[PDB]
Amino acid sequence: VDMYIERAGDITWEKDAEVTGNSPRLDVALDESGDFSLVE
């Protein structure tokens, strides 16, 4: 198995981008394995 990369674009801000998604505020913890979980 080999992994390879292919260019897909420039890194640029786009003026006419679609806008979506909410902005939740969440308490979380990050463990040693890099996993986030919720906290209460």
């Binding site: 198995v1 080999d2 992994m3 390879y4 990369i5 292919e6 260019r7 897909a8 674009g9 420039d10 890194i11 640029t12 801000w13 786009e14 981008a17 679609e18 806008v19 979506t20 998604g21 909410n22 902005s23 939740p24 505020r25 969440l26 308490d27 979380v28 913890a29 990050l30 040693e32 394995s33 890099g34 986030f36 979980s37 919720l38």
Partner: protein
């Protein structure tokens, strides 16, 4: 070696993630490659720095991306989904509140092959990578490394 956003592919072929080439260094999420070497045409990229807890890895040199969300402004996910042209998705981040401080988070849900896609500020700087998060719907941290 050109600056830009890149698909990370495996062998038929399958897209496992995305990454950012900047200043000669390739940046992606650890869970995308597990630190395996990468081919770039005829050339090979070897891992240089990696951290499972941050879920990040850099190839050919140290992590170069250092911009950070400002806590107020909308950002853009430069999503590169499998089989689809790179596209920008603008959003106001929410917040991951942790015992070590707050982290920006985007409530956007794209296929797993999109992990490693960069999140940009209005200046066009990469403020982190998409694809390590929690489920409440999926919410991704804005994951940035240290330069």
């Amino acid at each position: 070696t050109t600056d830009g956003v890149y698909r990370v592919m495996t062998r038929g072929s399958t897209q496992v993630g995305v990454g950012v080439m900047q200043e000669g260094v390739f940046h992606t999420m650890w869970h995308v490659t597990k630190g395996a070497a990468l081919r770039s045409g005829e050339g090979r990229l070897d891992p240089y720095w990696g951290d499972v807890k941050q879920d990040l890895v850099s190839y050919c040199g140290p992590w170069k991306l250092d911009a950070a969300w400002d806590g107020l402004s909308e950002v853009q996910l430069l999503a590169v989904p499998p089989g689809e042209r790179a596209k920008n998705i603008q959003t106001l981040p929410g917040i991951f509140k942790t015992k070590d401080g707050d982290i920006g988070a985007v409530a956007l849900d794209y296929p797993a092959g999109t992990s490693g896609s960069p999140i940009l500020d209005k200046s066009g700087r990469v403020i982190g990578l998409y694809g390590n998060g929690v489920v409440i719907s999926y919410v991704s941290a804005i994951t940035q490394g240290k330069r």
